[PDB]
């Protein structure tokens, strides 16, 4: 399913970057998982992950790197601390299951 994220974002001088990752759902899912992967040299590592029941605030597993806020079908992420950062959205319930993969975000550090 179509996931939209910016092509490029700028990171502040304190190493924190913020971008919006929005997603549409063919149905209306009440149980969503949002993941952020880092892709460099074909291999991918997990930046962070959060589980989302719509309207109940975005709960992140481990807030060491990512803190984010929900507002409908948009998620405003914040990552702290030079590859490609991909926003992943999983519509778990109700069926059907949907996987969404954004086109990736480049992060330039001024």
């Amino acid at each position: 399913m179509h996931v939209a994220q910016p092509a490029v974002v700028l990171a502040s001088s304190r190493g924190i970057a913020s971008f919006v990752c929005e997603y549409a759902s063919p149905g209306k899912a009440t149980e969503v998982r949002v993941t952020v992967l880092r892709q460099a040299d074909s291999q991918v590592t997990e930046v962070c992950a959060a589980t989302y029941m719509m309207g109940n605030e975005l709960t992140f597993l481990d807030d060491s790197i990512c803190t984010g806020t929900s507002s409908g079908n948009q998620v405003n992420l914040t990552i702290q601390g030079t590859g490609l950062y991909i926003c992943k959205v999983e519509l778990m319930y109700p069926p059907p299951y949907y996987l969404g993969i954004g086109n990736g975000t480049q992060i330039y550090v001024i």
Partner: antibody, heavy 118, light 109 residues
């Protein structure tokens, strides 16, 4: 090195039950969704069932809906497949499969054979 | 249900030749949700291509993929003896996860 080893296959009569296991090693088990995929002899691949990271959500193919139950034990790095009310149409190789973080089934077990016949 | 469709049923080529395997989807599926698998007789499937174009780890460069929407392609630029096997495409963007019928690549003689 990612490893999937399934067990519990065997020969069984229609209506009976069989329990399969898939032992995973070489990766953080709870960080990946899992599938069972089956392959009848001489035919193609058919997806059977899917399970979430912790197990909150499970989905099944229509041919097994109501008779198969997928489960996992992240504490023991094991995946399960309780298959009841077996039919001859369930005769196949049952593969244990991991879902990659970008979608595909990136790792497969070597498979365990089940034969349902009267 | 997204029905996948492969062609041909059997490819008859010689070692060193170029193989082109087709996969068709009954409705449009994004490139990020298509994969190709190789299976040799008596062995479990093995991932080659994911995201239509990207190549799995440990897969030689002679394997590549292309296409979007309805029609997808797997290309083997130069067939090696170990490349003669069965190949399956799959969509993994939504449930149920569906596979194609498979395509057999045999040695022509």
């Amino acid at each position: 090195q990612v490893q999937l080893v399934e067990s519990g296959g065997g020969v069984v009569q229609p209506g009976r039950s069989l329990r399969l296991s898939c032992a995973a090693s070489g990766f953080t088990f709870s960080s990946y969704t899992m599938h069972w995929v089956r392959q009848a002899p001489g035919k193609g691949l058919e997806w059977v069932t899917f399970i979430s990271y912790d197990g909150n959500n499970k989905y099944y193919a229509d041919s097994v809906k109501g008779r198969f139950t997928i489960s996992r034990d992240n504490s023991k790095n094991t995946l399960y497949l309780q298959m009841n009310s077996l039919r001859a149409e369930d005769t196949a190789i049952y593969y244990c499969a991991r879902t990659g973080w970008l979608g595909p089934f990136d790792y497969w077990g070597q498979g365990t054979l089940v034969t349902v016949s009267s | 249900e997204i029905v996948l469709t492969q062609s041909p049923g059997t490819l008859s080529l010689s070692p060193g030749e170029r193989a082109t395997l087709s996969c068709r989807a009954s409705q449009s599926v994004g490139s990020s949700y298509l994969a190709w698998y190789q299976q040799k007789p008596g062995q479990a499937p093995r991932l080659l291509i994911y995201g239509a174009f990207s190549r799995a780890t440990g897969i030689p460069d002679r394997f590549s993929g292309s296409g979007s929407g309805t029609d997808f392609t797997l290309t083997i630029s130069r067939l090696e003896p170990e490349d003669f096997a069965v190949y399956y495409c799959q969509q993994y963007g939504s449930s149920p996860w569906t596979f194609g019928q498979g395509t057999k690549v045999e040695i022509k003689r």
